[PDB]
C-alpha cells in the first residue's frame, strides 16, 4: 500500500496515524500539491492529498473514504464502532474535525497570496468557523459525547486538526477555556503515532 | 426532518434529490451561508450547508455523511449497494463529484472577490482539477465502472456537479468529447427529482 501525502497535511496525518496504530506496513510517497509541477494528479484528478494506492493500483480519496477503507481491513485496534449509526456519529465528528482543518488550510492559503490579493474578511470568517467548532468539541466532552480518553477516528482527527492549528499558528487561543479539549489532544499527542508524524518546523 | 440549505448549492441538491427519490417528507430551511448575517451556525459550527436536522435536534453534516444517514433509513430506492466495499467504491466516486463541486465553488467565490484581489492562477488550477476529474468520469463510463443508466449516490452527485458547472458557467467544455458523461447526466436531468431542484436563474 502507498500513502500519497505531504509532511504537513493534517488530512494525511490522520491516515498515517491510523496505519501506524494498526501496525499496517505502507510506503509514503511525498508530494507538494500546491507547487505547479507535482505528481499528485496521477493518483487523484482533484490534485489533493491524501491518496491511498492499493497493491492492485486502485486509488482511494478523499481522507474520510480512505479512513473507512482502512477500517474495513478489520485490523486492531478498531477506530470505528461496529454499529452503523454509532459509526456514522463518529464520522460526523470526524467531518467536524476535517472542517477545522479545512478552515485552517484556507487561512494559510489566504496568507500565501500576494499581500494586495489577500482578504482580511476571509481570514476572519475562517477564524470564526474554527472557534465555533472548537466550542462544539468542548461541549461534546462536557456532555460525555466524547471522553478525554477516547481514541477513535474522530479523536485522532480532532488532535490532527489542533496540531495543525498550532503548527500554522492559526487560532492561538484554541486552548483558552477549553480544558477538556486540551486534555483530549494532550492524551493523543502522547502516543507514538503522533510523535512520529509531527509536521516539520524550521 | 429539516434540510438546511441554499437553492443554488449542489451539495444540498444532492440530498434534496435523495429525499425526493425516496419519497421522504422534509422541510427545507433556506440559508445564505456567504452573507455575514445568516442562520447556519446554529446548525453547523462550520457555517456550511447542507445540514440535516432530525426530529430530535441532532444536526448532521457534511453532505456525504448526511447521504449515508439517509441511506441507513433503508427506504426505496436504495442509492448505495449493500456490500461494504462496493458501497465505499460508490462513495469514492461521490467524493470525486463532490470535489468537482468544490472546485466549481472555489472558482465562483474567487470571482466574487474584488477585482484587484482575484488570482487568475487560482482560477486556472481549479479549472484543471475539473477537467482532469471529468476525464476520469468519462473513463469510468468507457470502462463500465459506471453505466449511463446507473442511478446511485455517485451518479446523482455527478449530475449535481455538472448541473452546477453549467449554472455557474464554469468549464463550458465539460461536454466536449465526453459523450458518455453527457448521456449519463442527461439521463439524470430527465428525472423529476432533478426537474424540481434546479438552481434559480434570472
Ligand atoms: N477533502 C480532502 C481535503 C484534502 C486537502 O485539502 N488536502 C490539501 C493539503 S492539506 C491539498 O492537497 N491541497 C491541494 C489543493 O487544494 O490544490 C480530504 O479530506 O482528504
Ligand atoms: N464538505 C461540505 C461542503 C459544503 C459547502 O461547501 N457548502 C457551501 C455552499 S455550496 C457553503 O455552505 N459555503 C459557506 C462557506 O464556505 O462559508 C459538504 O460536502 O457538505
Curated annotation (Swiss-Prot), chains A, B:
This is Uncharacterized GST-like protein YibF. Glutathione (GSH) transferase homolog, that might be involved in selenium metabolism. Residues 1-78 form the GST N-terminal domain. NCBIfam families: PRK10357.1 (NF007682). InterPro entries: Glutathione-S-Trfase_C-like, Glutathione-S-Trfase_C_sf, Glutathione_S-Trfase_N, GST_C, Thioredoxin-like_sf. PANTHER family: MALEYLACETOACETATE ISOMERASE (PTHR42673:SF4). GO terms for cellular component: cytosol. Belongs to the GST superfamily. HSP26 family. It comes from Escherichia coli (strain K12). GO terms for biological process: glutathione metabolic process; L-phenylalanine catabolic process. Residues 83-202 form the GST C-terminal domain. It comes from the Bacteria.
